[PDB]
């Protein structure tokens, strides 16, 4: 397979999620609709980003490697929606939501800026992203879990399951940054792209399917 084939696979998997989430969503109440819409934005945006890369756009040369701008741009746009979805489940306050979205955005911006820096100082930017990510994990497993524990059993149960998926899989991305083209380039561009397609698909579409499966059991 080539890079563009993998990008096409990403785009299609994301489209399948989006379609599934949109249609599952025709069945929802006032308080439920926001969850389905959020899943549609997450996978819909990622679907378009993958089309962009597949069409050969945003392949930025950085020294002797290629970093995919749409990769990082779509994370910047979609990860706050994932955190938003989780914060809705947890029953988060206005202020604490601002804190997690900020931390999230620092991670994504730092990783994007780092991928763009040819010199060794890109690792300092990575480092800042990594520290912010640890702060993010703390909120997810600490304060946000405390808030979620006050909700109904079905909601608490979905939060913990999506929280665990999120915490474990999001922790893998920085290692791929370090081992792939942005870091020491031990992963080929193709393997790097395949892993991120898979990871993007699970953290968005898998996440969504898990939510769809629980939501159906709760209301009915």
């Amino acid at each position: 397979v080539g890079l563009t084939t993998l990008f096409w696979l990403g785009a299609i998997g994301m489209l399948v999620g989006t379609l599934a989430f949109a249609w599952a969503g025709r069945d929802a109440g006032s308080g439920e609709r926001r969850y389905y819409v959020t899943l549609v934005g997450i996978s819909g945006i990622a679907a378009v980003a993958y089309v962009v890369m597949a069409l050969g756009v945003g392949w930025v040369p950085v020294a002797e490697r290629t970093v995919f701008a749409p990769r990082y741009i779509n994370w910047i746009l979609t990860t706050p929606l994932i955190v938003y979805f989780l914060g809705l489940l947890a029953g988060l306050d206005s202020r604490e939501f601002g804190i997690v979205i900020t931390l999230n955005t620092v991670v994504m911006l730092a990783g994007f800026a780092g991928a763009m820096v040819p010199g060794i100082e890109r690792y300092a930017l990575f480092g800042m992203g990594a520290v912010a990510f640890l702060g993010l994990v703390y909120y997810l497993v600490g304060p946000m879990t405390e808030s979620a524990s006050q909700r109904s059993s079905g909601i608490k149960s979905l939060y913990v399951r999506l929280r665990n998926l999120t915490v474990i899989l999001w922790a893998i991305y920085p290692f791929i940054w370090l081992l792939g083209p942005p870091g020491v380039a031990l992963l080929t561009p193709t393997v790097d792209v395949a892993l991120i397609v898979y990871l993007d698909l699970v953290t968005k579409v898998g996440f969504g399917f898990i939510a769809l499966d629980a939501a159906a059991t709760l209301r009915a």
């Binding site: 399951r161 665990n164 998926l165 474990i168 899989l169 893998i172 290692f175 791929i176 081992l179 892993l195 898979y198 990871l199 699970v202 898998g206 898990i210």
Partner: peptide, 13 residues
């Protein structure tokens, strides 16, 4: 890395 991803998925669900 793929093992980690698969295990994360399995553990999580």
């Amino acid at each position: 890395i793929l093992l980690g991803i698969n295990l994360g998925l399995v553990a999580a669900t």
